[PDB]
Design an enzyme around this catalytic site. Structure first.
Site, PDB file in Angstrom:
ATOM      1  N   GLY A 199       2.490 -14.182 -19.024  1.00 60.62           N
ATOM      2  CA  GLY A 199       1.640 -15.236 -18.516  1.00 60.62           C
ATOM      3  C   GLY A 199       1.532 -15.199 -17.001  1.00 60.62           C
ATOM      4  O   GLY A 199       1.774 -14.181 -16.350  1.00 60.62           O
ATOM      5  N   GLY A 200       1.157 -16.346 -16.439  1.00 56.40           N
ATOM      6  CA  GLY A 200       1.056 -16.472 -14.999  1.00 56.40           C
ATOM      7  C   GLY A 200       2.374 -16.634 -14.279  1.00 56.40           C
ATOM      8  O   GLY A 200       2.391 -16.637 -13.045  1.00 56.40           O
ATOM      9  N   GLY A 233      -1.223  13.371  12.322  1.00 53.64           N
ATOM     10  CA  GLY A 233      -1.012  11.936  12.353  1.00 53.64           C
ATOM     11  C   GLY A 233       0.283  11.509  11.698  1.00 53.64           C
ATOM     12  O   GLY A 233       0.769  10.401  11.936  1.00 53.64           O
ATOM     13  N   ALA A 234       0.860  12.373  10.861  1.00 53.91           N
ATOM     14  CA  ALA A 234       2.140  12.051  10.244  1.00 53.91           C
ATOM     15  C   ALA A 234       3.232  11.905  11.293  1.00 53.91           C
ATOM     16  O   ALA A 234       4.119  11.056  11.163  1.00 53.91           O
ATOM     17  CB  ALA A 234       2.511  13.119   9.220  1.00 53.91           C
TER      18      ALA A 234
END
Ligand code: BTI
Ligand code: BTI
Lengths: 131, 489, 244
Positions: B150-151, B385-386
């Site tokens: 459920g929620g 960019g790593a």
């Protein structure tokens, strides 16, 4: 020989296997301590593969006692300041089915001294562990 | 006297009270509220009132330090929440917000209680708001011992860490009945939301345990690392280990060939204290490692690449994992230590079709926003960019170190040689790629520019890390005034 | 060990007892400093130590005038609470009140103003509070004497307590206007049995737990040790406007 026995156990090797178990079992065998051996000794005493010899009752009891002492010593490290315990009652059992539940006590009277006994209100032995 | 719990144990399952007893100290649990009823008066519920009302909330005490907890009860009404169940949880969280204490909850609810109507939704909303407001103030840990549908699934999600039990637990938003109704596929509950699925596929669960007993035993160990609140300092424990212990095995870990792989744990383990690693999410995105560890008796955060799996290449899942870990570590003033070995980002259409641009920016945002002391060690390589993302010196890094065989370049030698000579005479490969790699694929240029503090022998890493982490104990840095950031979701 | 508290409260509801017999066991030995001992004797205020730290004590006394709140008692308690909170001193209260003192002189003297001072002092306070309900708490007196709804930290009750809107007679009168005569015998007893007990207040969630009277020292020490670092703040004001 005793020296070798003792010196085998203090050789810490980590990262790969070895044959120290075979050397230990061969040295501890009463046939080897009898005095004389042969060249066909190994396969004569190891017919099917290799199987290390087991432990007697007192050795397993001592291992239990040392394990309980180590558990308590490492437990006391995590507690903060003086809010730490000094006595427990543990239930040691090797194997996935709890074979031979052995109640154990511990008291930690000093930094490297305990008062191992069967349980509460049982006679104590005061062994020593340094780890 | 072992009444009314024989029915539970017969199904090879434990009870909420037994779990609470196992977690805390032997005799330091004080149950807060115990005589509360649902007062529903609908659908034939005016009868069968229950004293506890399906919840056990108390205070407890772990390792001499206070805690707060609550546990669902499966026997009573299936563990459903109500207007009345949620009140106790709200009171506990509010009290743990006034005092600097964390909260740990053992979820077992079968869903909402239909007989209360929208009051269950009201309770869910209140719990959600408390979780949202108090996240980043007090650490929140959640463990799922049984069904959770459920929620109600959302409140564990907002919590910092979620753990799962192997045999008898699952979690999902919608049941398989609705899936069969709409799509027409028959999937079991375990096939849908089992612990393995969330351990490997969705990345929600932070770990899995084989038994409840082991779960408690290791949850205590995890709790021993955390700080008590937002304003409290990082805990420091006594330890016989010392910074002068010899580590010369690090001189040989890195192979002399550039195409052979190695295990980064062989570098991680010597630096930290013995038997003090607690890996987080061990089975998800294995190309990156995150967890907690101690250095000279103080807890730190570990984030390192692994060339064993997929050549240690950054990805979507790795980015999310590292970003969450960095954000949590910084929120509570925990030092960060990183080991860098990355050839770049994973190339593929699926990656762009899945939004690599959004996800890869999360790790960079987390590293740049952080203000805790940082230590970075570049073992072998860092390209493109790593190199920028993995805590480079320009992102307000404190101290950066490199090993003598490292490489820091814009890209691989082949691409640079191609772009630097468009139609240069053929066979240019042999006499240009070797020269370029020799001249610029080495830490000498990056050291000349000033991007690494010093080039060190691999045997001095423990000494340097302990020295720097001891000196940096009292850094005070502050970001410009904001209501809050805007992270790329 | 404090087991003498199990017998302090008499089993009759119309007999009186001395609240000091409850105050003294909980605090440390020979550590009470009464404030204003000869004025408004129906309420006790002073300083005391619990496990080596100074706390503030405010308790009713059924010995004098059935432990009924009044003008003078309200002023005394209000001043004590305000001073204690101003300097971050924990407050411990013991509750036993049947209501307010009825009389024309009281209204001609302004009970409405004075009784509000104690409520203001209790509500404005931000120090840790501990409350113990020994026997009874009725009407607005229950609200005033540090009820759980006024941001109280922990509240406890004893197994023979009573928390109701008013006495059984008035409730029975208002709930049955012209019901058949002799209604007293078979209605007042039933109403007191069903609703003059801490079970209903515990069901609503107004008391944390119902405890044995022998555990009061343990509970108070535990709570006062845990609450050592509470940080609560009121909305921004130049200052309040207390009913003078
Ligand atoms: O040379 C051709 C393929 C080179 C790929 C090198 C690795 S694979 C993933 C990452 N993305 C790159 O551009 N380089 C690395
Ligand atoms: O039953 C008639 C008189 C009951 C008075 C009960 C006490 S006296 C002062 C206080 N005010 C009340 O209404 N009840 C209590």
């Amino acid at each position: 020989i005793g020296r070798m026995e003792k010196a085998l156990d203090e050789y810490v090797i980590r990262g790969l296997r070895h044959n120290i178990c075979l050397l230990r079992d061969v040295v501890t065998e009463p046939r080897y301590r009898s005095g004389s051996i042969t060249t066909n000794y190994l396969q004569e005493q190891y017919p099917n593969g290799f199987k290390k010899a087991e432990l007697t009752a007192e050795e397993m009891q001592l291992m239990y006692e040392v394990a309980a002492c180590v558990h308590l010593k490492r437990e006391r490290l995590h507690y903060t300041q003086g809010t730490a315990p000094s006595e427990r009652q543990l239930y040691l059992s090797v194997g996935a089915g709890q074979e031979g539940e052995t109640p154990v006590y511990v008291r930690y009277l000093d930094d490297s001294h305990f008062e191992i006994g069967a349980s509460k209100h049982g006679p104590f032995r005061k062994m020593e562990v340094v780890w | 006297p072992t009444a009314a719990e024989d029915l539970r144990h017969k199904k090879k399952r434990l009870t909420a009270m037994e779990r609470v007893q196992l977690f805390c100290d032997p005799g330091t649990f004080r149950e807060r509220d115990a005589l509360v009823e649902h007062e529903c008066h609908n659908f034939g519920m005016e009868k069968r009132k229950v004293p506890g009302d399906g919840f056990i909330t108390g205070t407890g005490k772990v390792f001499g330090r206070p805690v707060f907890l609550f546990s669902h009860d499966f026997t009573v009404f299936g563990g459903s929440l109500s207007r009345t169940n949620a009140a106790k949880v709200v009171r506990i969280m509010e009290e743990a917000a006034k005092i600097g204490v964390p909260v740990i909850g053992f979820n077992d609810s079968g869903g909402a209680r239909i007989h209360e109507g929208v009051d269950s939704l009201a309770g869910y909303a209140d719990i959600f708001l408390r979780n949202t407001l108090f996240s980043g103030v007090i650490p929140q840990i959640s463990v799922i011992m049984g069904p959770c549908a459920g929620g109600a699934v959302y409140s564990p999600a907002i919590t910092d860490f979620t753990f799962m039990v192997e045999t008898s637990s699952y979690m999902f938003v919608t049941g398989p009945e609705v899936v069969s109704a709409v799509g027409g596929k028959l999937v079991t509950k375990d096939e849908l939301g089992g612990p393995h699925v969330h351990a490997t596929k969705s990345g929600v669960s932070a770990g899995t345990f084989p038994n409840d007993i082991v779960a408690m035993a290791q949850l205590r160990r995890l709790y021993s690392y955390l700080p008590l609140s937002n304003r409290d300092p990082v805990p420091v424990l006594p330890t016989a280990d010392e910074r002068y212990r010899d580590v010369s095995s690090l001189n040989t870990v890195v192979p002399t060939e550039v195409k052979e792989a190695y295990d980064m744990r062989d570098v991680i383990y010597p630096v930290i204290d013995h038997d003090s690693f607690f890996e987080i999410q061990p089975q998800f995105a294995k190309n990156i490692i995150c967890g907690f560890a101690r250095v000279e008796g103080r807890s730190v955060c570990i984030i390192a690449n692994q060339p064993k799996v997929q050549a240690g290449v950054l990805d979507i899942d790795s980015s999310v994992k590292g970003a969450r870990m960095v954000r949590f570590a910084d929120a509570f003033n925990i030092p960060i230590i990183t080991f860098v070995d990355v050839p770049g980002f994973l190339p593929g259409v699926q990656q762009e079709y899945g939004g690599i641009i959004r996800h890869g920016a999360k790790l960079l945002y987390a590293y740049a926003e952080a203000t805790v002391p940082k230590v970075t060690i570049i073992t072998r390589k860092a390209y493109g960019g790593a190199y920028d993302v993995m805590s480079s010196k320009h992102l307000r890094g404190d101290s950066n170190y490199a090993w003598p065989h490292a490489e820091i370049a814009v890209m691989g030698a082949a691409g640079a040689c191609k772009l630097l000579y468009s139609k240069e005479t053929a066979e240019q490969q042999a006499q240009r790629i070797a020269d370029y790699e020799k001249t610029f694929c080495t830490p000498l240029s990056a050291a000349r520019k000033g991007f690494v503090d010093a080039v060190i022998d691999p045997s001095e890493t423990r000494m340097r890390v302990c020295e720097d982490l001891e000196r940096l104990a009292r850094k005070q840095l502050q970001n410009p005034w904001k209501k809050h950031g805007n992270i790329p979701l």
